[PDB]
Design a protein around this motif. Structure first.
Motif, PDB file in Angstrom:
ATOM      1  N   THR A  84       0.873  -1.198   0.000  1.00  0.00           N
ATOM      2  CA  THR A  84       0.000   0.000   0.000  1.00  0.00           C
ATOM      3  C   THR A  84       0.900   1.235   0.000  1.00  0.00           C
ATOM      4  OG1 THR A  84      -0.257  -0.066   2.379  1.00  0.00           O
ATOM      5  CG2 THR A  84      -1.885  -1.299   1.092  1.00  0.00           C
ATOM      6  N   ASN A  94      -1.730   4.572   7.430  1.00  0.00           N
ATOM      7  CA  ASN A  94      -2.924   4.419   8.310  1.00  0.00           C
ATOM      8  C   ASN A  94      -4.057   5.370   7.881  1.00  0.00           C
ATOM      9  OD1 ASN A  94      -1.490   2.414   9.888  1.00  0.00           O
ATOM     10  ND2 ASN A  94      -0.428   4.093  10.907  1.00  0.00           N
ATOM     11  N   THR A  95      -4.023   5.921   6.655  1.00  0.00           N
ATOM     12  CA  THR A  95      -5.130   6.715   6.049  1.00  0.00           C
ATOM     13  C   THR A  95      -5.956   5.785   5.166  1.00  0.00           C
ATOM     14  OG1 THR A  95      -3.908   7.441   4.110  1.00  0.00           O
ATOM     15  CG2 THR A  95      -3.648   8.777   6.096  1.00  0.00           C
ATOM     16  N   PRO A  96      -7.228   6.121   4.844  1.00  0.00           N
ATOM     17  CA  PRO A  96      -8.071   5.234   4.033  1.00  0.00           C
ATOM     18  C   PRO A  96      -7.459   4.765   2.693  1.00  0.00           C
ATOM     19  CG  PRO A  96      -9.397   7.014   4.977  1.00  0.00           C
ATOM     20  CD  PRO A  96      -7.951   7.314   5.317  1.00  0.00           C
ATOM     21  N   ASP A  98      -4.518   4.066   2.161  1.00  0.00           N
ATOM     22  CA  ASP A  98      -3.492   3.055   2.533  1.00  0.00           C
ATOM     23  C   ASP A  98      -4.116   1.652   2.575  1.00  0.00           C
ATOM     24  OD1 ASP A  98      -0.814   2.434   3.003  1.00  0.00           O
ATOM     25  OD2 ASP A  98      -1.023   2.544   5.191  1.00  0.00           O
ATOM     26  N   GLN A  99      -5.411   1.525   2.283  1.00  0.00           N
ATOM     27  CA  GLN A  99      -6.125   0.231   2.120  1.00  0.00           C
ATOM     28  C   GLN A  99      -6.083  -0.202   0.646  1.00  0.00           C
ATOM     29  OE1 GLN A  99      -6.031   0.576   5.692  1.00  0.00           O
ATOM     30  NE2 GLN A  99      -7.315  -1.198   5.144  1.00  0.00           N
ATOM     31  N   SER A 110      -9.214   1.798  -7.332  1.00  0.00           N
ATOM     32  CA  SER A 110      -9.370   2.361  -5.966  1.00  0.00           C
ATOM     33  C   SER A 110     -10.855   2.433  -5.586  1.00  0.00           C
ATOM     34  CB  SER A 110      -8.722   3.708  -5.844  1.00  0.00           C
ATOM     35  OG  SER A 110      -9.525   4.706  -6.471  1.00  0.00           O
ATOM     36  N   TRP A 134      -8.896  11.450   1.255  1.00  0.00           N
ATOM     37  CA  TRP A 134      -9.571  10.469   0.369  1.00  0.00           C
ATOM     38  C   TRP A 134     -10.329   9.432   1.214  1.00  0.00           C
ATOM     39  CZ3 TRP A 134      -9.555   5.247  -0.440  1.00  0.00           C
ATOM     40  CH2 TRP A 134     -10.127   4.791  -1.630  1.00  0.00           C
ATOM     41  N   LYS A 135     -11.530   9.056   0.791  1.00  0.00           N
ATOM     42  CA  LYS A 135     -12.365   8.001   1.421  1.00  0.00           C
ATOM     43  C   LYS A 135     -12.886   7.081   0.326  1.00  0.00           C
ATOM     44  CE  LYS A 135     -12.851  10.720   5.475  1.00  0.00           C
ATOM     45  NZ  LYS A 135     -11.524  11.209   5.015  1.00  0.00           N
ATOM     46  N   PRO A 136     -13.106   5.777   0.602  1.00  0.00           N
ATOM     47  CA  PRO A 136     -13.655   4.863  -0.401  1.00  0.00           C
ATOM     48  C   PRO A 136     -15.091   5.215  -0.814  1.00  0.00           C
ATOM     49  CG  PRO A 136     -13.625   3.828   1.781  1.00  0.00           C
ATOM     50  CD  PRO A 136     -12.809   5.101   1.878  1.00  0.00           C
TER      51      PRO A 136
END
Ligand SMILES: *[B@]([O])([C]N1[C]=C(C2=[C]S[C]=[C]2)N=N1)OP([O])([O])=O
Length: 354
Positions: A84, A94-96, A98-99, A110, A134-136
């Motif tokens: 990641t 450890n931010t979204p 990073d998933q 993404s 950023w968020k999914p």
């Protein structure tokens, strides 16, 4: 063999009058023999002819060099595609975002990244903040949306993994390994007289503006002979150093499918022979502009072909190669023409040879 000039004159030359294109370079490589056809002007105002020294903006064909740089970093063990971005870009740990893994960034899955950054994002700090916030949206890995920021971040991570800025990764490592002599992220003072003007839909002279993570997404400039060398490398990776050979082979592996289009690293991949409409549908509004649910590869094609389009405001690009026929084509123009016309002209030429 005398056939090739006549076929390019029949299928490419009429596009100059039809779309009022000042300049075009069309290259064919067949059985390790190069054919270069030049038409019209690099600069209308200077009455300067398109020639083997003319530098064109590649636009999205730059993504193929970003993909190759990723393949080089992976096979040197500098990155894994399961990693990641936070592992390299510490401020993203450890931010979204990073998933999302490096493959998902490289192949636009993404689940929430559009074609462009918002216009407001320009500086390095604004780019970082954008990825921090950023968020999914869609389930990660399930939806393809073609995206400059997605492969842009992949490029920045590849550079961090090799402890060089992205421009130096290409200019000092990747271009030299491929034997490219006139390929640039930044065109130097000594080559500016060989840098074509692009022309917009009002035939006004224009060049690409700086932008956030421009280099890995659409920022490379090159000549017809260099792009024919790049196609040569993709057709015959065995002739090249081990490191760049593995890099190139990494870009040819399909990762998922959207109907008849297989997404490899940068390259679009098809079953060969492909129908004209299969190649046209690959760059339809539906595929290029909107999200599309991906499938796992079911039919793994025995015999493959690959292509990529590229556009800046002033330039059009198309590259296609077919390993089984040992043939490929490059089209460079200093005005955009519809993707349909680029793909169709290349289809007729390559199907009439052999
Ligand atoms: B790439 O170069 C993606 N692309 C096109 C553009 C653009 C064209 S006119 C203004 C901006 N920006 N990024 O090319 P593509 O994959 O669309 O052929």
């Amino acid at each position: 063999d005398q056939e090739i000039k006549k076929l390019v004159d029949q299928n490419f030359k009429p596009l100059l009058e039809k779309y009022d294109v000042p300049g075009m370079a069309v290259g064919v490589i067949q059985n390790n023999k190069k054919y270069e056809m030049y038409y019209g002007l690099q600069s209308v105002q200077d009455k300067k002819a398109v020639n083997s020294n003319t530098i064109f903006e590649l636009g999205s064909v730059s993504k193929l060099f970003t993909a190759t740089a990723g393949g080089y970093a992976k096979n040197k063990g500098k990155i894994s595609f399961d990693d990641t971005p936070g592992k390299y870009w510490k401020e993203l740990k450890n931010t979204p975002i990073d998933q999302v893994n490096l493959l998902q960034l490289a192949t636009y899955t993404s689940g929430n990244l559009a074609l462009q950054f918002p216009d407001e994002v320009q500086t390095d700090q604004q780019v970082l903040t954008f990825f921090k916030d950023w968020k999914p949206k869609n389930p990660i890995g399930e939806y393809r949306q073609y995206s400059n920021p997605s492969i842009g971040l992949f490029g920045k991570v590849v550079a961090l993994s090799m402890n060089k800025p992205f421009d130096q990764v290409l200019e000092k490592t990747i271009f030299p390994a491929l034997g490219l002599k006139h390929s640039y992220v930044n065109v130097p003072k000594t080559q500016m007289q060989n840098y074509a003007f692009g022309y917009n839909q009002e035939n006004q002279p224009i060049r690409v503006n700086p932008g956030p993570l421009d280099a890995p997404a659409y920022g490379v400039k090159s000549t017809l002979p260099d792009m024919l060398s790049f196609i040569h490398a993709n057709l015959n990776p065995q002739k090249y150093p081990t490191d760049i050979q593995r890099a190139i082979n990494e870009t040819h592996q399909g990762r998922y499918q959207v109907n008849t289009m297989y997404q490899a690293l940068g390259w679009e991949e098809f079953s060969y022979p492909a129908t004209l409409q299969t190649l046209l549908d690959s760059n339809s509004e539906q595929i290029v502009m909107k999200p599309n649910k991906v499938t796992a590869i079911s039919k793994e094609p025995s015999v493959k072909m690959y292509h990529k389009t590229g556009s800046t405001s002033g330039f059009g690009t198309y590259v296609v190669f077919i390993p089984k026929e040992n043939i490929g084509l490059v089209m460079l123009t200093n005005k955009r023409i519809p993707n349909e016309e680029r793909i169709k002209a290349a289809y007729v030429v390559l199907n009439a040879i052999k």
